[PDB]
Design a protein around this ligand. Structure first.
Ligand SMILES: O=C(O)c1ccc(O)c(-c2nnc3n(Cc4ccccc4Cl)c(=O)c4ccccc4n23)c1
Ligand SMILES: CC1(N)CCN(c2cnc(-c3cccc(Cl)c3Cl)c(N)n2)CC1
Length: 475
């Protein structure tokens, strides 16, 4: 669960919540009053606020480490005591009762129209009735409305138990379905889908999401679902693999990691299946050889670099390619940089990859280096990114039996997830045309189960909508 995250509270509300309802070791996370986060912890009768920064690459904790998600951050510190500091301990989550980041909560709602149009057997939603709530379910086919009485800070369906939150009530009736007199089981199988749009109606959705914003609420609801993606990252934790990670706590899921054929099988990279991708971190001096072994083994012919080598005076990715016209050996792999072409937003490098001692293994690898992405945030216009993805897509499509496209930035989750998701969404619109259904958070949740924290910020999330809108507008 992710109940420790409170989306609509202030620092004072957090302090009073922790002092009156928590104990020593009580904690909560919250958005900054913007784009930053606060971890508030009770220690020796007093509340300590710790800043968490995300500019689009990773969650950066003051006095701690860098993480792919807030859930991974909390999971780590709740398991590894002494790592946060005077040591600060995360013992007890202080649960949030606010239903705003729940998939099924639709405040003011109409609900019968949505359930009849979009719904199926077990599709449900919760809405605001005075101060009371309504649970509306579809079964088959028909729609049933259950009143939810709010009586003295507690919620109930007219009898039995009284829950401290709508979430507790929903979860209880999810596991224990209400049975109507004549036998209809009020199965709450899945929340009603309200995010799937028809591609031709994107400008309408972007307009509604821009109203007081809706983009923030939709993104935080997606963030609440990240607690279901805490898959094992054991291989990245091995002693022999620690120095192969750019960030010690940003690791690849074992079940999707690229396996390389003493301990020569590891790279911090994952296969992303929607044309497949490999999402990876920027090379380290000690991982350049593992990087070319991955490119060669996977039969990849296109590499997308979405970062400069150095940003804000800090190394983001080492130069893993030779200078123009030069030849270099990276272990068993040989790379020639044949030609470099400069365009406004990017540089194209035509590389020739082969295994040393075997000439017939040679293939051209096209490296598309996007150089104009800002240090913080996202571009103000998606046209540059869209023209770039269009060219990358056409190169990939022209090469018979080409392997997955290699995509990397620094940690390989923010800008990498953003470029991949845009590329997945636009591909549906290429194959199926303007008359197709696209579901942005569904696409992201799917990519995120293949690599942690793919798409880092709300600014990137909004950029994905703007990019899809722009692609459809130029169709
Ligand atoms: O063994 C399994 O089947 C299994 C299943 C689900 C999982 O989430 C994991 C697991 N994978 N990584 C982690 N980390 C991260 C970590 C540990 C050490 C060094 C760096 C990093 Cl960044 C956790 O802190 C963690 C904490 C509690 C419970 C599982 C955890 N876990 C393993
Ligand atoms: C007002 C509200 N609380 C905010 C927006 N909203 C929703 C609903 N569903 C998703 C969704 C869709 C597909 C996959 C995933 Cl994981 C998610 Cl979470 C979403 N992001 N927002 C509706 C309720």
């Amino acid at each position: 669960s992710r109940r420790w995250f409170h989306p609509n509270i202030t620092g004072v509300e957090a302090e009073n919540l922790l002092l009156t309802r928590g104990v020593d070791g009580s904690f909560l996370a919250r958005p900054s009053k913007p784009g930053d986060f606060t971890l508030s912890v009770r220690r020796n009768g007093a509340v300590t606020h710790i800043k968490i920064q995300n500019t689009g690459d990773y969650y950066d904790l003051y006095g701690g480490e860098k993480f792919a998600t807030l859930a991974e951050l909390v999971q780590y510190y709740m398991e590894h005591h002494g790592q946060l500091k005077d040591v600060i301990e995360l013992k007890y989550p202080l649960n949030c009762a606010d239903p705003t980041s729940e998939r099924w909560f639709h405040g003011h709602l109409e609900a019968e129209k949505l359930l009849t149009e979009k719904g199926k057997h077990g599709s449900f939603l919760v809405r605001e009735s005075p101060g009371d709530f309504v649970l509306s379910v579809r079964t088959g086919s028909k729609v049933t409305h259950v009143m939810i009485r709010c009586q003295e800070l507690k919620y109930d369906v007219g009898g039995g138990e009284r829950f401290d939150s709508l979430t507790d009530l929903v979860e209880h009736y999810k596991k224990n379905p209400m049975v109507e007199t004549l036998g209809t089981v009020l199965q709450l199988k899945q929340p009603l889908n309200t995010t799937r749009i028809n591609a031709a109606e994107i400008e309408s959705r972007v307009r509604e999401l821009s109203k007081l914003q809706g983009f923030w609420e939709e993104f935080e609801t997606l963030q609440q679902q990240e607690c279901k993606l805490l898959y094992s990252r054991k291989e990245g934790q091995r002693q022999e693999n620690k120095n192969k990670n750019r960030y010690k706590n940003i690791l690849p899921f074992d079940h999707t990691r690229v396996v390389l054929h003493p301990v020569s099988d590891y790279i911090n990279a994952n296969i992303i299946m929607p044309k497949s991708y490999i999402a990876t971190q920027g090379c380290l001096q000690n991982t350049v050889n593992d990087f070319w072994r991955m490119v060669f083994q996977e039969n990849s012919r296109v590499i997308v670099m979405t970062t400069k080598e150095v940003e804000r005076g800090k190394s983001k990715c080492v130069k893993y390619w030779p200078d123009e016209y030069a030849l270099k050996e990276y272990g068993v792999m040989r790379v020639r940089n044949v030609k470099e072409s400069a365009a406004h937003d990017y540089t194209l490098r035509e590389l020739k990859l082969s295994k040393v001692g075997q000439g017939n293994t040679e293939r051209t690898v096209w490296q598309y280096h996007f150089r104009t992405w800002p240090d913080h945030g996202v571009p103000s216009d998606p046209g540059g990114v869209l023209d770039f993805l269009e060219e990358v897509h056409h190169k990939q499509e022209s090469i018979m039996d080409a392997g997955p496209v290699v995509v990397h930035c620094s940690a390989g989750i923010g800008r990498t997830g953003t470029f991949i998701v845009i590329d997945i969404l636009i591909d549906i619109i290429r194959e199926k045309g303007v008359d197709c259904d696209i579901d942005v958070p569904k696409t992201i949740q799917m990519v995120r189960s293949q690599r942690s924290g793919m798409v880092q910020t709300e600014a990137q999330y909004r950029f994905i909508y703007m990019a899809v809108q722009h692609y459809i507008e130029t169709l």
